[PDB]
Amino acid sequence: GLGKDHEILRRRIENGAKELWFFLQSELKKLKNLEGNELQRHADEFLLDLGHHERSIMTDLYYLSQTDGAGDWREKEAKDLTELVQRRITYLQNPKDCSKAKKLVCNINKGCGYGCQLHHVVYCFMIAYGTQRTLILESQNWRYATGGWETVFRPVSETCTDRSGISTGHWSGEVKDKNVQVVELPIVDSLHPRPPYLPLAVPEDLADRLVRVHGDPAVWWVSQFVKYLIRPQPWLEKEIEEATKKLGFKHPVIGVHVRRTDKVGTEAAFHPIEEYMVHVEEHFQLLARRMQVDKKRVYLATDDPSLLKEAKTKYPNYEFISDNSISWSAGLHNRYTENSLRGVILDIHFLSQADFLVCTFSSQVCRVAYEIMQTLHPDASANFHSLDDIYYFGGQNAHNQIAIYAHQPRTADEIPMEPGDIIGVAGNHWDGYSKGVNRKLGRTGLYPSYKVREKIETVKYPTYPEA
Amino acid sequence: GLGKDHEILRRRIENGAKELWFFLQSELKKLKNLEGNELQRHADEFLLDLGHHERSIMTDLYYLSQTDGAGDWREKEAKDLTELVQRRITYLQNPKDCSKAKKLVCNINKGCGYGCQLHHVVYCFMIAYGTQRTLILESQNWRYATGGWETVFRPVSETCTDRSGISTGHWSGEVKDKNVQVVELPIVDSLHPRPPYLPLAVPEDLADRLVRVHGDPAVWWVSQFVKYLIRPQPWLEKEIEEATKKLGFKHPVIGVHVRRTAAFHPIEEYMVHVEEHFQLLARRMQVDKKRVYLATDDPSLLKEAKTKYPNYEFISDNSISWSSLRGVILDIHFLSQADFLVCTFSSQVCRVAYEIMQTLHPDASANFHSLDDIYYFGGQNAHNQIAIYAHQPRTADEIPMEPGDIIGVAGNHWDGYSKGVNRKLGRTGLYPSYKVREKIETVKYPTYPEAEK
Numbered sequence: 001g002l003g004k005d006h007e008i009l010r011r012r013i014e015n016g017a018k019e020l021w022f023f024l025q026s027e028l029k030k031l032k033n034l035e036g037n038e039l040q041r042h043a044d045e046f047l048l049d050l051g052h053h054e055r056s057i058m059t060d061l062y063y064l065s066q067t068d069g070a071g072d073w074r075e076k077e078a079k080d081l082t083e084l085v086q087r088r089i090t091y092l093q094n095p096k097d098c099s100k101a102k103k104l105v106c107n108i109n110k111g112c113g114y115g116c117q118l119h120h121v122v123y124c125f126m127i128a129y130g131t132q133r134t135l136i137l138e139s140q141n142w143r144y145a146t147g148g149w150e151t152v153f154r155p156v157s158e159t160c161t162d163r164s165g166i167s168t169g170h171w172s173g174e175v176k177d178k179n180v181q182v183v184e185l186p187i188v189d190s191l192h193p194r195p196p197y198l199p200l201a202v203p204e205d206l207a208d209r210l211v212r213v214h215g216d217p218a219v220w221w222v223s224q225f226v227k228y229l230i231r232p233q234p235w236l237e238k239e240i241e242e243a244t245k246k247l248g249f250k251h252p253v254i255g256v257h258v259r260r261t262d263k264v265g266t267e268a269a270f271h272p273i274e275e276y277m278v279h280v281e282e283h284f285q286l287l288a289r290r291m292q293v294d295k296k297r298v299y300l301a302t303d304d305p306s307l308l309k310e311a312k313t314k315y316p317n318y319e320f321i322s323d324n325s326i327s328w329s330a331g332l333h334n335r336y337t338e339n340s341l342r343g344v345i346l347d348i349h350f351l352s353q354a355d356f357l358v359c360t361f362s363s364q365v366c367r368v369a370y371e372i373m374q375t376l377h378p379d380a381s382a383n384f385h386s387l388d389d390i391y392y393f394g395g396q397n398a399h400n401q402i403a404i405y406a407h408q409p410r411t412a413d414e415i416p417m418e419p420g421d422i423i424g425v426a427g428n429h430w431d432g433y434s435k436g437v438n439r440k441l442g443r444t445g446l447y448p449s450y451k452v453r454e455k456i457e458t459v460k461y462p463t464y465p466e467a
Numbered sequence: 468g469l470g471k472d473h474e475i476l477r478r479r480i481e482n483g484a485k486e487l488w489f490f491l492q493s494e495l496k497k498l499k500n501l502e503g504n505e506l507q508r509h510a511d512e513f514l515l516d517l518g519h520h521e522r523s524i525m526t527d528l529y530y531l532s533q534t535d536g537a538g539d540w541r542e543k544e545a546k547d548l549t550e551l552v553q554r555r556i557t558y559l560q561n562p563k564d565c566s567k568a569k570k571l572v573c574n575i576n577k578g579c580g581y582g583c584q585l586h587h588v589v590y591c592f593m594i595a596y597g598t599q600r601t602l603i604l605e606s607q608n609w610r611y612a613t614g615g616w617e618t619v620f621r622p623v624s625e626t627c628t629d630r631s632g633i634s635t636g637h638w639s640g641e642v643k644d645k646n647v648q649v650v651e652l653p654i655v656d657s658l659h660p661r662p663p664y665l666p667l668a669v670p671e672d673l674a675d676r677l678v679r680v681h682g683d684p685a686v687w688w689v690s691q692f693v694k695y696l697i698r699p700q701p702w703l704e705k706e707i708e709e710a711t712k713k714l715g716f717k718h719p720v721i722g723v724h725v726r727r728t729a730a731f732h733p734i735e736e737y738m739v740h741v742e743e744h745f746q747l748l749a750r751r752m753q754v755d756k757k758r759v760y761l762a763t764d765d766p767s768l769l770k771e772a773k774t775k776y777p778n779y780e781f782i783s784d785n786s787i788s789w790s791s792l793r794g795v796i797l798d799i800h801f802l803s804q805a806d807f808l809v810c811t812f813s814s815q816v817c818r819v820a821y822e823i824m825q826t827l828h829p830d831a832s833a834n835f836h837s838l839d840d841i842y843y844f845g846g847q848n849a850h851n852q853i854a855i856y857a858h859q860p861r862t863a864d865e866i867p868m869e870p871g872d873i874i875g876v877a878g879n880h881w882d883g884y885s886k887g888v889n890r891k892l893g894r895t896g897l898y899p900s901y902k903v904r905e906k907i908e909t910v911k912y913p914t915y916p917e918a919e920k
């Protein structure tokens with residue numbers, strides 16, 4: 001049986017889109033009869049009117065996802081799936097006889113920062129899960145804390161943290177290492193041979209439930225291992241608890257990560273605070289349609305300690321929540337200390353706890369916070385805006401989309417598409433167009449983002465029925 | 468549980484709308500820095516890209532309405548509601564004792580065209596249904612046929628078609644006529660007193676189920692009496708079948724009705740919406756031939772349409788050798804059978820066709836485009852809307868609105884703005900159409916529980 005509110009909202013979304021289309025044709029015809037001041041004046045009003053109209057449509061779509069008991073079901077199903085995966089990971093990590101268990105050894109000391117190192121451990125963990133090997137994490141001489149993983153986080157196992165085994169060797173494939181008890185896994189950047197237990201694929205035994213519950217099952221699958229990893233030590237839980245109080249961290253709140261310093265060189269670009277705040281302002285307007293928002297709170301995480309004073313001045317109607325001492329210690333000089341390790345764990349924690357995350361996905365810091373966020377809600381796939389890259393996991397397999405609508409290129413920078421063409425996406429320009437390659441042609445260029453759908457990849461993982 | 472396709476479709480509608488907003492902000496910013504011919508070319512290309520993008524969203528929204536067995540449920544529920552009402556109407560129309568039954572007499576000979584006369588009979592029928600009086604239809608001296616109503620349609624009753632009784636009077640109110648057996652009802656144009664059994668209200672006992680199934684319950688309620696009235700005689704049934712074969716009426720097909728003897732609209736004003744909707748249909752089905760059923764009172768229009776749109780196939784009953792009443796009935800039939808209806812709702816004939824169309828699908832309320840008026844029923848009570856989002860007037864022609872304000876709508880300008888009066892402020896002007904919702908009116912009708920036995 002269909003719900004009454006479900007049908008009212010569906011038809012209102014249809015009529016709102018139709019009316020928006022009536023509005024677009026009428027106003028665009030008027031616009032091309034203008035030039036100079038009048039053209040700029042009316043197009044600005046046109047854009048303002050369109051914004052509210054578009055957000056009313058987005059608000060009805062939000063209500064549609066909650067009506068008819070769908071919100072409670074999606075919450076229950078996401079909770080059941082999380083507990084299913086966590087129990088499997090815990091069973092894998094705690095065999096009865098550690099001296100006889102197949103193992104995978106991971107070294108945390110990758111030459112990069114915390115988020116990059118955390119994603120290395122995640123990649124180790126997912127391959128360990130894929131091969132039914134207990135993850136052994138070797139973290140001594142960790143650049144952030146010489147005492148290792150247990151300085152901040154609980155150990156990845158309770159019964160089996162020892163590397164003992166009758167045979168040991170470097171990774172050389174799941175079939176060749178079939179009878180090697182202890183396999184050491186290197187970093188993903190030069191792994192050969194690559195096993196299938198890599199992003200962005202998900203387990204096929206969970207895929208049907210995931211696509212039904214979650215808008216990007218790839219990130220959800222990655223987040224399950226992030227969730228298991230960052231179980232905090234008791235002293236760290238209390239720091240997080242204390243910081244939440246002293247920071248005045250309450251909802252609604254939008255998280256903003258401004259990555260600079262050594263990233264601006266080659267891995268990303270410099271972005272003014274205005275580029276972040278336009279999306280912060282836009283999302284608070286959306287929230288104000290469904291809830292009361294008296295104070296617009298922004299948790300600002302950044303490695304530029306001069307940004308907080310700048311943001312408070314240029315956006316005085318916002319309440320910025322930030323730890324400027326953490327920002328200062330994030331500088332390349334004082335970056336690899338236990339106090340700085342606490343700082344980045346705290347910054348990522350509050351970013352992940354926000355109701356919306358504005359940042360650059362080229363930074364591993366924001367990707368981690370976006371992954372953790374997936375463990376805090378039934379489906380937080382779209383609660384982000386990245387100023388550059390789409391979501392990715394470094395070392396992932398080819399991220400492919402499928403063309404659903406044909407495209408004939410208007411300029412030379414666009415690529416043709418036929419329905420069914422596999423499209424290897426490179427990025428979303430957030431202007432209606434995405435850049436990628438057509439795997440029937442080899443051509444790279446732009447194409448309308450709405451003319452493709454995400455190709456969900458699946459992999460036959462072990463299901464751990466004993467758990 | 469939730470449906471996998473339902474969630475996939477909702478999220479794609481969400482992301483499709485989000486990408487549309489990305490596309491709008493980018494191209495409009497570029498559009499401000501243009502002038503002259505380059506502005507015209509980019510604005511025209513902008514509109515073309517927006518069209519296909521908008522239709523992808525609407526297509527996903529159509530699929531959403533169908534998945535998870537929702538299409539089957541809506542068809543079954545719309546069927547149950549129709550059978551329920553038709554069973555009640557049939558019970559009312561066929562009492563056991565005609566000489567003792569309470570009646571309402573309706574004269575079909577209103578001074579207007581066929582479509583307006585049919586609506587007069589509908590308005591009679593709805594009041595008869597409201598007052599539990601058997602409708603007696605008088606069709607002698609009908610300008611369209613000497614033999615009367617039954618030359619085309621079945622009699623409105625099988626057991627009670629005379630006006631016998633103990634007392635007869637003109638309409639004076641349901642309470643005053645409590646003991647008048649046979650009440651004669653005049654046209655609605657000067658009816659006094661007006662009863663509550665009038666559009667656009669729906670029966671309160673059906674309102675909840677109707678809102679769930681149908682996008683415009685008012686026209687659905689009107690269409691039930693249209694459906695009962697136009698039950699065809701066997702020979703009209705065969706003429707319709709013969710006309711269908713000879714014309715090659717097949718689906719998909721869009722109906723176009725062009726009335727021209729009040730205001731003049733050239734054929735291009737109709738065809739732009741015809742072409743737009745065939746582009747929509749082409750996204751969900753194969754469209755080999757773009758067929759258009761053209762109903763017109765203009766002999767030069769059909770040749771104009773064929774000349775200007777040579778890739779279209781135009782169909783009209785002028786192709787039929789054996790065909791005023793027969794012509795308008797066939798026109799109404801084929802227009803109502805179409806997948807989409809482009810016309811002017813100021814025409815009574817198109818309104819009839821739009822109403823019949825509601826009886827052929829679970830929810831066809833939106834399968835139209837009107838060049839002028841929104842749907843109405845002549846003689847209806849005030850059509851009111853409720854403002855849902857505030858509006859600050861941007862020009863002198865716009866009116867303010869606060870959430871909750873009752874808005875008496877005068878029409879939709881099909882440009883994003885509707886025209887009406889804000890009753891809280893006594894001000895009349897323009898307002899964005901998306902900032903209001905329809906105010907569904909209900910009336911306590913009889914429910915005829917004896918019709919279930």
Ligand SMILES: CC(=O)N[C@@H]1[C@@H](O)[C@H](O[C@@H]2O[C@H](CO)[C@@H](O[C@@H]3O[C@H](CO[C@H]4O[C@H](CO)[C@@H](O)[C@H](O)[C@@H]4O[C@@H]4O[C@H](CO)[C@@H](O)[C@H](O)[C@H]4NC(C)=O)[C@@H](O)[C@H](O[C@H]4O[C@H](CO)[C@@H](O)[C@H](O)[C@@H]4O[C@@H]4O[C@H](CO)[C@@H](O)[C@H](O)[C@H]4NC(C)=O)[C@@H]3O)[C@H](O)[C@H]2NC(C)=O)[C@@H](CO)O[C@H]1NC(=O)C[C@H](N)C(=O)O
Binds near residue numbers: 266397
């Ligand atoms: C040995 C070691 O220790 N290495 C350390 C690294 O591991 C650390 O991390 C790496 O940091 C890099 C830089 O941030 C990361 O690169 C980014 O990778 C993105 C992912 O690319 C994937 O997926 C894309 C789809 O999203 C796809 O298009 C790519 O082709 C790529 O996919 C391939 O696909 C193969 C199948 O086809 C598959 O087999 C491969 O496995 C897969 N590769 C990976 C890595 O998964 C990528 O999207 C980024 O690209 C953008 O940015 C650069 C500038 O940095 C631009 O040049 C690019 O054009 C691209 O621009 C983007 O383009 C979009 C389209 O227009 C646009 O919208 C975006 O805005 C724009 N982005 C901009 C402008 O910023 C980029 O290449 C890499 O993923 C990280 N790897 C891991 C494992 O985490 C690294 C951290 O700093 O540190 C290294 N350590 C050292 O160097 C140690 C040092 N030597 C020492 O001191 O000792």
Ligand SMILES: CC(=O)N[C@@H]1[C@@H](O)[C@H](O[C@@H]2O[C@H](CO)[C@@H](O[C@@H]3O[C@H](CO[C@H]4O[C@H](CO)[C@@H](O)[C@H](O)[C@@H]4O[C@@H]4O[C@H](CO)[C@@H](O)[C@H](O)[C@H]4NC(C)=O)[C@@H](O)[C@H](O[C@H]4O[C@H](CO)[C@@H](O)[C@H](O)[C@@H]4O[C@@H]4O[C@H](CO)[C@@H](O)[C@H](O)[C@H]4NC(C)=O)[C@@H]3O)[C@H](O)[C@H]2NC(C)=O)[C@@H](CO)O[C@H]1NC(=O)C[C@H](N)C(=O)O
Binds near residue numbers: 839841843844876878
């Ligand atoms: C005695 C006899 O037999 N008479 C015959 C008539 O009965 C036949 O039918 C009547 O035809 C009229 C002409 O087409 C119809 O009038 C139209 O009615 C429209 C509906 O008005 C409703 O609903 C509106 C909302 O949609 C609302 O705004 C209106 O105010 C009106 O509502 C009132 O509401 C009251 C409560 O407040 C309620 O008590 C009343 O009962 C109710 N009235 C009715 C009638 O229901 C109306 O929208 C039409 O108006 C548009 O068109 C006229 C031009 O005709 C314009 O001047 C208007 O401004 C308006 O324009 C529209 O404006 C919109 C806003 O900008 C815009 O979007 C539209 O595009 C635009 N449309 C245009 C320009 O076309 C119009 O008034 C009437 O409803 C019919 N009545 C019935 C019962 O069917 C008639 C036709 O066959 O024939 C008569 N017979 C003869 O003439 C023969 C003669 N006696 C002889 O020669 O012998």
Ligand SMILES: Nc1nc2c(ncn2[C@@H]2O[C@H](COP(=O)(O)OP(=O)(O)O)[C@@H](O)[C@H]2O)c(=O)[nH]1
Binds near residue numbers: 335
């Ligand atoms: N506390 C804190 N630390 C940061 C911030 N931005 C960068 N850092 C530090 O700089 C390191 C950057 O390494 P990585 O995690 O790979 O992030 P990436 O360089 O942006 O890809 C982080 O691990 C942090 O130690 C920030 O906003 N807050």
